[PDB]
Homo-oligomer: A and B are copies of this chain.
Amino acid sequence: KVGVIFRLIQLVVLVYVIGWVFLYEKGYQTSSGLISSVSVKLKGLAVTQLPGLGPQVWDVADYVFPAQGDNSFVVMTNFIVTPKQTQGYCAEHPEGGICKEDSGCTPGKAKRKAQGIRTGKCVAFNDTVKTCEIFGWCPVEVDDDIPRPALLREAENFTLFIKNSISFPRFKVNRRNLVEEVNAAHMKTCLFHKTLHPLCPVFQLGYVVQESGQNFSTLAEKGGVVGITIDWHCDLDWHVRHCRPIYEFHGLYEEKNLSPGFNFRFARHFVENGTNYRHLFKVFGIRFDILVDGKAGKFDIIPTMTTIGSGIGIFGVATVLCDLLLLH
């Protein structure tokens, strides 16, 4: 009965190997990619009482800078506005050259960062320091006084709405972020929590940043970067109703570096009294990147046949190894 016992042991080993191969979903299921489309819709307000008077309100279309969605969008969090900018010869900015007596600066564009077409003169900047005279946007920026109170910190309570639609080809199955569990009644009193309500897509910017690993009120002065990822891991063997996304906010938390924080200049032009003016904002804001990836598969007979053939081959190899070790 030694031979029968050995044959039974080999058969059991082969069965276990086949079960392991069919486990982990390594085989018997196809692999397909996905195509995605993401839209965002922020909703909030912000008071902007400024010592320069003229209170202003930043609406939904005033801080979302792409203003129409896109994967990578920026939400304004702070700014240094220099209104009523016009073209004309006047004093330059410091850290770009110091004028001693009509000799420090020579006519021509300066190397690397430039502020205007230098003409050559010692025009008294109203900071006890005399600099060069340039031809450009006359009221130059003053970015030293970054606003500590975080003028638009009230963005902590904004509600981001990530509407995601995907399609798996080769199965022609299309799904959306709004899973049939979430209905209209769950969109008026809905927030997002990773354990309590993991399906409703109405996130809160404060909460998103908090789960990003970045403390708020310190990246508001100089906007950081936040990355949201919507993993779509689904199996088409079961009903399509079991296709749900997983949100993971891998926030690249640094809070201290050589050049920390996002920052960009943007200007809006207009015409007043027949002269072209310009409003320039140095906006610091938090940029959200919404990366979408996934993999789904279903029953196909070719991968099943290939896996069964590989299982037969590895079972034969195992029997060869067992015979070899028994020979020794």
Chain A residues packing against B (C-beta within 8 Å)? 33, 35-37, 39, 41, 43-45, 47, 55-57, 59-62, 65-74, 87, 109, 111-117, 135-137, 154, 157, 159, 163, 165-167, 169, 174-176, 178-179, 182-184, 187-189, 225, 227, 229, 248, 250-254, 257-259, 262-272, 274, 276, 280, 283, 285, 287, 289, 291, 293, 312-314, 316-321, 324
Tell whether, in the assembled complex, residue A87 and residue B55 are in contact, meaning their CB atoms are under 8 Å apart: yes
Is A317's CB under 8 angstroms from B317's CB?
Answer: yes
Residues from chain B with a CB closer than 8 A to the CB of A165 are 225, 252-254
| Contact flag A253-B59 (CB < 8 Å), given A67-B264, A69-B74 | no
Determine which residue in A47, A112, A136 has the highest number of CB atoms from chain B within 10 A of its CB, and name it. A112
B167, B265, B289: the one within 8 Å of A67 (CB): B265
Q: Tell me whether A55 and B252 are in contact in the complex, defined as CB-CB below 8 angstroms, given that A61-B280, A267-B62 are known contacts.
A: no
* Residues B68 and A68 in contact, CB atoms below 8 Å apart: no
With both chains docked as a complex, state the minimum distance between the C-beta of A113 and any C-beta of chain B, in angstroms: 5
B258 and A187 within 8 A (CB) = yes
Question: Is A251 a contact partner of B289 (Cβ separation < 8 A)?
Answer: no
Residues of B within 8 Å of A314, CB to CB, are 313
Contact A116 B45 (CB under 8 A): yes
Whether A87 contacts B117 by the Cβ 8 Å rule is: no
Query: Main SS of the interface on chain A?
Result: mixed
**Chain B residues near A41 (CB-CB < 8 A):** 263-264
Identify which of A166, A189, A253, A254 gathers the most chain B CB atoms within 10 Å of its CB: A253
Nearest chain-B residue to A285 (Cβ)? B68
A270 CA to B61 CA in the complex, in Å? 14
Closest chain-B Cβ to A20's Cβ sits at a distance in Å of: 11
Q: Is the CB of A70 within 8 A of B67?
A: no
Give chain B residues whose Cβ lies under 8 Å from the Cβ of A35. Answer: 227, 229, 250, 252, 289, 291
A179 in contact with B283 given A137-B57, A266-B67, A266-B68 (CB within 8 Å): no
**Could you say which residues of chain B place their CB within 8 Å of the CB of A66?**
66, 68, 70
Pair B112/A68 contact, Cβ less than 8 Å: no
Q: Which of B250, B259, B317 contacts A163 (CB 8 A)?
A: B259
Given the interface pairs A112-B159, A187-B259, A251-B174, the reply to whether A68 lies near B73 with Cβ below 8 Å is yes
Given A167-B253, A324-B316, do A60 and B265 touch, yes or no (CB 8 Å)? yes
| Residues of B with C-beta under 8 A to A276 | 56
Known contacts A35-B252, A39-B225; 9 further A-B pairs (Cβ under 8 A): A57-B87, A60-B265, A68-B264, A163-B259, A184-B258, A270-B271, A317-B317, A320-B320, A320-B324
A287 and B69 CA atoms in complex are apart in Å by 10
Bound CA span A69–B261, Å: 13
Min CB distance, A244 to chain B, in Å? 15
With a cutoff of 8 Å between Cβ atoms, the chain B residues found around residue A319 in the complex are: 324
